[PDB]
């Protein structure tokens, strides 16, 4: 029930439920939820086929929570998490939240300098790490005195002084703990539950701080199905806000959360078939895969009911394609930023126009402002989207300048161009910083990208501005064709020439490639793309 308030501000409605917010801390709300689920399955390791009960989660969170306190972790301390999706990941995060510590997950594919830059943003006192990243993490922690200890969820290393094996700690008979642990009370308004590293044009990430309030208010907020009885698959990485908050919310609703370490084409399809996955979180890259890759037909996907996509531009042409190929009833697209905790806009049964991002979630205000002025725009006027509500981040840790630039008067200036129609359904056009500056025009690469993805001969597409002396930027398309097909640069140029405005002309040419660089969250790594121009 969105409302158009005076002044051209859109409102998603008042937040009715207050269960999570009433809690004394996110750690206590998670523990009680898990305990209240009894012995039901809540986590399924798809690769190894191991079901995990709610009581197993509760017991392990209690044990690990005590161990953290013994190791010196105190309320509002920071603990790092560098690991693929796994039960130990969830156990590590929940335990850290149980003791009232900030959890700072770290991208698993990070490099020495990115890892070093991340842990220098949040300054974790203890860091969890699996075998895939322990060597890099231990090596980096050596050059940072604030890191007092590393816990290895798997594997080992000698490049750091104080390393603990999680298995030995959990099982230490000499360390006696009670069957139940209770989380301390949090200043929900200021205590930081999560520090999520966001990608930016800087090349190095910023640390967005999400308070307990941000998370509890989000918890208190797509289809008519009760999520509790849902078998849910999440391939988005859990160190990203989308996958991270999706793991928490799904956990609090008692759903059956199936997971893979990362994403893999065959493992993804295989998981949906074996475990009868009914709903899955996706990023556009996976949606395009479902829509294009021929391997998709080699699997039984009948159990799939809902596809929840977000994090990057997704066109209706791709949505329709997927629905017409595999026959999934519900495809819902959502929009949000790391700075907005989770989504601020989601499609539903009533507001699910093709290619839209839905309507505001309760408690969130939205406004479309014209850049180069604060002019608040009306319906159907494109402008920079700004959001206000209980989901807005507290700010970039240690970077008050970047925070003032982003949050004005409680409004998050997302930096994206969008608009809302007369039903207050929102549409995301593109990111201002990624608009191709060609002869004063601000061409949205996402528009051309959607057009190129309608061509059955194109498997993936990414458009970038090519540096030019007179024009400044010329649209250039990185194209990934399908296997058994013939495609030429001229044919691609002709395609957009006959279906797009003269400004979208691929004057920069075509550059066929077998794979487009994407980040673990499905965002086109434009930075890398501009480097390949050779
Ligand atoms: C249920 C939905 C859960 C979504 C959570 C993901 C949060 C996240 O993505 O955090 P990030 O900070 O990494 O991304 C922030 C930036 O990503 C771009 N963006 C994000 N969503 C869309 C979209 N639906 N359509 C077009 N663009 C999108 C945009 O430009 C934005 O400013």
Radius of gyration: 23 Å
| Structure classification | alpha/beta
Helical residue percent band = 25-40%
Strand content: 25-35%
Number of E-type strands: 29
The oligomerization state is: monomer
In CATH, what is the homologous superfamily of the domain at 432-532? ANL, C-terminal domain
How is the biggest beta sheet arranged? 9 strands, mixed
Helical region count?
16
Query: How many angstroms separate the termini?
Result: 51 Å
* Overall CATH class of the domain at 432-532: Alpha Beta
Under the CATH scheme, which architecture of the domain at 432-532 would be assigned?
2-Layer Sandwich
User: What is the CATH topology classification name of the domain at 432-532?
Assistant: GMP Synthetase, Chain A, domain 3
- Gross geometry: globular
Order the strands across the largest sheet as they lie in space. 4-3-13-12-14-15-16-17-18
Bound molecules: 5'-O-[(S)-hydroxy(octanoyloxy)phosphoryl]adenosine
Pfam family, one: AMP-binding_C
GO biological process, one term: fatty-acyl-CoA biosynthetic process
Keywords: ATP-binding, Ligase, Luminescence, Magnesium, Monooxygenase, Nucleotide-binding, Oxidoreductase, Peroxisome, Photoprotein
Domain AMP-dependent synthetase/ligase: 36-396
């Amino acid at each position: 029930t969105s409302k158009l308030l005076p002044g051209n501000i859109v409102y998603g409605g008042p937040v009715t439920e207050r269960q999570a917010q009433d809690s004394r801390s996110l750690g206590q709300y998670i523990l009680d939820k898990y305990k209240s689920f009894g012995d039901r399955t809540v986590l399924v390791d798809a690769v190894n086929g191991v079901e995990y009960s709610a009581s197993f989660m509760h017991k392990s969170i209690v044990r690990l929570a005590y161990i953290l306190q013994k190791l010196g972790v105190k309320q509002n301390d920071v603990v790092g998490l560098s690991s693929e999706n796994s039960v130990n990941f969830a156990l590590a995060m929940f335990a850290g939240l149980a003791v009232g510590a900030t959890v700072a997950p770290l991208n698993v594919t990070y490099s020495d300098r990115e890892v070093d830059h991340a842990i220098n943003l949040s300054k974790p006192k203890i860091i969890f790490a699996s075998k895939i990243t322990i060597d890099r993490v231990a090596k980096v922690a050596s050059k940072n005195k604030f890191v007092k200890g590393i816990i290895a969820l798997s594997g080992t290393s000698k490049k750091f002084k104080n390393i603990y094996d999680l298995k030995e700690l959990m099982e230490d008979e000499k360390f006696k703990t009670q069957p139940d642990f209770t989380s301390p009370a949090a200043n929900k308004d200021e205590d930081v539950s999560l520090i999520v590293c966001s990608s930016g044009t800087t090349g190095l990430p910023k640390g967005v701080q999400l308070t307990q309030m941000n998370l509890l208010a989000t918890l208190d907020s797509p289809t008519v199905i009760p999520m509790e009885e849902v078998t849910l698959l999440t391939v988005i990485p859990w160190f990203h806000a989308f996958g991270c908050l999706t793991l928490i919310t799904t956990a609090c609703v008692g759903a059956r959360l199936v997971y893979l370490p990362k994403f893999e084409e065959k493992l993804f399809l295989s998981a949906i078939e074996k475990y009868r996955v009914m709903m899955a979180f996706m990023v556009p890259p996976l949606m395009v895969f479902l829509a294009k890759h021929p391997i998709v037909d080699k699997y039984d996907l009948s159990s799939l009911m809902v596809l929840l996509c977000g994090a990057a531009p997704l066109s209706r042409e791709t949505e329709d394609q997927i629905k017409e190929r595999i026959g999934v009833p519900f495809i819902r697209q959502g929009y949000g930023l790391s700075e907005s905790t989770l989504s601020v806009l989601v499609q539903n049964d009533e507001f699910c126009k093709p290619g839209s991002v839905g309507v505001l979630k309760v408690g969130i205000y939205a406004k479309v402002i014209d850049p180069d002025t604060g002019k608040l725009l009306g319906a159907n006027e494109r402008g920079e989207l700004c959001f206000k509500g209980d989901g807005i981040m507290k700010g970039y840790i240690g970077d008050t300048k970047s925070t003032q630039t982003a949050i004005k008067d409680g409004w998050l200036h997302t930096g994206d161009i969008g608009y809302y129609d007369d039903d207050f359904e929102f549409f995301i056009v593109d990111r201002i910083k990624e608009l191709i500056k060609y002869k004063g025009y601000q061409v949205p690469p996402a528009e051309i990208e959607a057009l190129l993805l309608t061509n059955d001969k194109i498997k993936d597409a990414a458009v970038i501005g090519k540096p030019d002396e007179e024009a400044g930027e010329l649209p250039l398309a990185f194209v990934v064709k399908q296997a058994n097909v013939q495609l030429t640069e001229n044919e691609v140029i002709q395609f957009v020439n006959d279906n797009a405005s003269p400004a979208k002309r691929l004057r920069g040419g075509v550059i066929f490639v077998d794979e487009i660089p994407k980040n673990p969250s499905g965002k086109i790594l434009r930075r890398i793309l501009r480097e390949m121009l050779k």
